[PDB]
Design a binder for this molecule. Structure first.
Ligand SMILES: CCCCCCCCCCCCCCCCCC(=O)OC[C@H](COP(=O)(O)OCCN)OC(=O)CCCCCCCCCCCCCCCCC
Lengths: 318, 67
């Protein structure tokens, strides 16, 4: 029945990414002093069944000027590498056990931006043309900030797999010891996935609407359901790579219970920001990475290398 | 002969500007901060120095049998 363990995953998650869109504007509602979608629910909890159905009724135009062969294979992705990445992710028991799999995320973190470059180019001119070009450029310069500061800690835990990374955070919430890094693990995923303070990719201010501009109701649910299938995953990751829970070979169930009451707090962070801060004006946006974020990330790497060796600490792995 | 202004008495309420409250300033931070980071590592160097002590124990059974 291994095929019914899968399809029990893909389906029950599409409800979260659906019902996030509701808690989008309730939480961001009371920052403003008001209430959130209310009239339709009664509580509102019934809103997203009505919204999923307005789009696919609503007619899906294509530009007369487009290349239809690319205008499909691209979105036929924004929903794969979002739903594949979930596969080897322990909670506690991952569906797959990949030996070195931690590295496998970067494989699928790196291969999504090659679905932006298609779509914005697939269609047409300068609002999605050079406007989907220069959100490529920022999306690849926030990896080098990443793979390093992912690679740092992994000196402090011994291997590339995720079954060890529950063992080492036992009674030490891995955020003490590298708290300088942890910050930069946060501003990255918020800068890379195109969210609030570095917002530019999806346009509001700097342009009209980035990269979404052409898709009518028909395809544009996918992206608007793809872009929220990354955001609740990196944030359902960070908390396996920092704030660890305590496995329990007996009541596995109490592992996940206490696990979603963390990863679900953590997420409610990209909403708790977006009410707050303004945007960066694309110069300042990269111009603050090389100069500023990076020099440290190298420097710390020269540090977490020696700290095990200089304490006879060297973590028990191959 | 019903008009607005009261007989006497008012505020005012000021227009002035203040809220600069801190908050562990001026090197008080960098003091607690570097203090936590250490107790992080001291919490390592022991778990990680214990876990190796089990590591050898595990490779022991392998060599024990396998003649
Ligand atoms: C648009 C519609 C048309 C497209 C439809 C089809 C699209 C397919 C796209 C493929 C995208 C995902 C491919 C990524 C490959 C990743 C494989 C991997 O990393 O598996 C990890 C695992 C490592 O093995 P390890 O854990 O070290 O040892 C276990 C010991 N028991 O490895 C293993 O366990 C062994 C590997 C078994 C899998 C066999 C090889 C699978 C990979 C073939 C991919 C073919 C490329 C397809 C096109 C890719 C384009 C992106």
């Amino acid at each position: 029945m291994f095929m019914i363990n899968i399809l029990m995953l893909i389906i029950p998650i599409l409800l979260a990414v659906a019902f996030l869109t509701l808690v989008e504007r309730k939480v961001l509602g009371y920052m403003q002093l008001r209430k959130g979608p209310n009239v339709v629910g009664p509580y509102g909890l019934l809103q997203p069944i009505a919204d999923a159905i307005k789009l696919f009724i609503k007619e899906p135009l294509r530009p007369a000027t487009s290349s239809a062969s690319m205008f499909i294979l691209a979105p036929i992705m924004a929903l794969g590498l979002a739903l594949t990445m979930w596969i080897p992710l322990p909670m506690p028991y991952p569906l797959i056990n990949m030996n070195l799999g931690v590295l496998f995320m970067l494989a699928m973190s790196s291969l999504a931006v090659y679905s932006i470059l298609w779509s914005g180019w697939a269609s047409n001119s300068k609002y999605a043309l050079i406007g989907a070009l220069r959100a490529v450029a920022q999306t690849i310069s926030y990896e080098v900030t990443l793979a390093i500061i992912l690679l740092s800690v992994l000196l402090m835990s011994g291997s590339f797999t995720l079954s060890t990374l529950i063992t080492t955070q036992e009674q030490m919430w891995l955020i003490l010891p590298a708290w300088p890094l942890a910050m930069m693990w946060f501003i990255s995923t918020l800068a890379e996935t195109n969210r609030a303070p570095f917002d530019l990719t999806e346009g509001e201010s700097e342009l009209v609407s980035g990269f979404n501009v052409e898709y009518a109701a028909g395809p544009f649910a996918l992206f608007f359901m793809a872009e929220y299938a990354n955001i609740i995953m990196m944030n359902i990751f960070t908390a396996i790579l920092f704030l660890g829970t305590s496995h329990n070979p007996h009541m596995p169930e109490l592992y996940t219970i206490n696990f979603t009451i963390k990863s679900l707090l953590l997420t409610m962070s990209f909403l708790w920001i977006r009410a707050s801060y303004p945007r960066f004006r694309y110069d300042q946006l990269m111009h603050l990475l090389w100069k500023n974020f990076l020099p440290l990330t190298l420097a710390l790497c020269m540090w977490h290398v020696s700290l095990p060796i200089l304490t006879s600490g060297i973590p028990p792995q191959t | 002969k019903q008009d607005m202004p009261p007989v006497g008495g008012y505020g005012p309420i000021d227009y002035k500007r203040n809220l600069p409250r801190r908050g562990l300033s001026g090197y008080s931070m960098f003091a607690v901060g570097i203090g936590a980071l250490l107790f992080g590592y001291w919490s390592m160097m022991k778990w990680n120095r214990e876990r190796r002590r089990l590591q050898i124990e595990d490779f022991e059974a392998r060599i024990a049998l396998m003649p």
